[PDB]
């Protein structure tokens, strides 16, 4: 029961964590897409 009590809390915490990591993955995806679009905009604005 002491281990089931250790495990319960730790696993809840790690689920909160992997979800936090997944949320950051979406943030990185938004960042990398913004880099490519702005770089293409800069290349498209090179002539101007």
């Amino acid at each position: 029961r002491d281990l089931e009590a250790s495990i319960a809390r730790y696993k809840e915490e790690y689920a909160v964590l992997i979800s936090e990591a997944q949320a950051i993955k979406a943030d990185l995806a938004a960042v990398e897409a913004k880099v490519n679009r702005s770089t293409a905009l800069l290349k498209s604005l090179s002539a101007e």
Binding site: K34, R37, S38, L41, S44, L45, E48
Partner: protein, 48 residues
């Protein structure tokens, strides 16, 4: 010949608005361009 002169007159007119509008977009935006995705979309559409 008559149709082309009308077409070329409109085409040169549109390019003048396109360079004016694109200049206005960079001259009326506050902060940074990347912050507002609307400005980025407008520049791409004007460039397109």
């Amino acid at each position: 010949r008559s149709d082309l002169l009308k077409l070329q007159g409109e085409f040169q007119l549109r390019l003048r608005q396109l360079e004016k509008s694109l200049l206005q977009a960079l001259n009326e935006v506050k902060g940074r361009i990347l912050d507002d995705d609307t400005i980025i979309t407008t520049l791409e559409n004007l460039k397109r």
